[PDB]
Design a protein around this ligand. Structure first.
Ligand SMILES: *[C@@H]1O[C@H](CO)[C@@H](O[C@@H]2O[C@H](CO)[C@@H](O[C@@H]3O[C@H](CO[C@H]4O[C@H](CO)[C@@H](O)[C@H](O)[C@@H]4O)[C@@H](O)[C@H](O[C@H]4O[C@H](CO)[C@@H](O)[C@H](O)[C@@H]4O)[C@@H]3O)[C@H](O)[C@H]2NC(C)=O)[C@H](O)[C@H]1NC(C)=O
Ligand SMILES: *[C@@H]1O[C@H](CO)[C@@H](O[C@@H]2O[C@H](CO)[C@@H](O[C@@H]3O[C@H](CO[C@H]4O[C@H](CO)[C@@H](O)[C@H](O)[C@@H]4O)[C@@H](O)[C@H](O)[C@@H]3O)[C@H](O)[C@H]2NC(C)=O)[C@H](O)[C@H]1NC(C)=O
Ligand SMILES: *[C@@H]1O[C@H](CO)[C@@H](O[C@@H]2O[C@H](CO)[C@@H](O[C@@H]3O[C@H](CO)[C@@H](O)[C@H](O)[C@@H]3O)[C@H](O)[C@H]2NC(C)=O)[C@H](O)[C@H]1NC(C)=O
Lengths: 48, 77
């Protein structure tokens, strides 16, 4: 439970260093870019 | 990475009615000024056209805010 709660907002440093707080949607947008789909796609289709 | 700071962010900025998105970094609001920088190290840069991109209007982007975008053309011309 702690792990999931943490990762939900903690992001990339969660298991590496100091905790940070990143807005959920911002984190997701990045991970999409991490695959190879332009970041803006997520925001436009955020609802879907 | 370690010692950090609190900043306000934005999914995108609106300029000339168009939705501008960051390239490799994130938009960051400092003590009354917007910049763009990499997530892993706070080093703020001026927001310029060539360091961002534009796609779609300021219509469907949630949390989009108003801002300006620097264009070298102005001082160059
Ligand atoms: C980023 O910056 C943009 C630009 O400022 C903001 O978008 C604007 O938001 C405002 C407020 O919603 C829109 O206001 C427009 O005002 C026009 C003037 O009429 C009003 O003000 C006069 C002042 O004396 C009063 O007398 C009058 O009674 C009104 O109170 C309106 O004419 C505009 O109406 C438009 O939409 C209607 C919709 O049916 C149309 O019928 C009209 O013909 C017209 O299109 C409107 O109300 C302003 O237009 C917005 N501009 C843009 C470009 O969107 C963003 O909100 C801001 N972002 C953030 C996050 O704040
Ligand atoms: C948020 O971003 C804002 C926009 O960048 C920041 O505003 C800037 O704040 C600094 C304060 O450090 C102002 O600096 C001015 O610099 C001039 C020039 O002299 C200084 O630099 C020379 C270089 O060798 C040095 O020798 C001198 O001793 C000075 O250090 C000074 O004359 C001014 O008094 C002042 O120091 C920037 O100009 C200012 N930018 C703008 C556009 O106003 C803001 O501080 C940032 N806030 C946070 C919390 O980071
Ligand atoms: C980023 O902002 C958050 C808050 O939005 C900061 O966390 C909060 O920091 C304060 C001060 O360090 C913590 O203590 C508080 O002090 C006030 C002083 O009067 C007191 O009234 C409060 O009851 C409390 O003691 C506060 O607990 C803390 N809150 C949380 C959830 O951490 C955070 O430190 C900021 N980060 C950076 C890098 O600035």
């Amino acid at each position: 439970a702690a792990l999931v709660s943490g990762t939900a907002t903690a992001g990339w440093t969660f298991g590496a260093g100091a905790a940070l707080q990143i807005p959920f949607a911002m984190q997701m947008a990045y991970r999409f870019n991490g695959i190879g789909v332009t970041q803006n796609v997520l925001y436009e289709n955020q609802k879907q | 990475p370690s010692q950090e700071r609190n900043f306000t962010t934005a999914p995108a900025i609106c300029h000339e009615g168009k939705a501008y998105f960051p390239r490799e970094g994130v938009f960051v609001f400092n003590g009354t000024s917007w910049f763009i920088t990499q997530r892993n190290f706070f080093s703020p840069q001026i927001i310029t056209t060539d360091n961002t991109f534009v796609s779609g209007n300021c219509d469907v982007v949630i949390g989009i805010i108003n801002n300006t975008v620097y264009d070298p053309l102005q001082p160059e011309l």
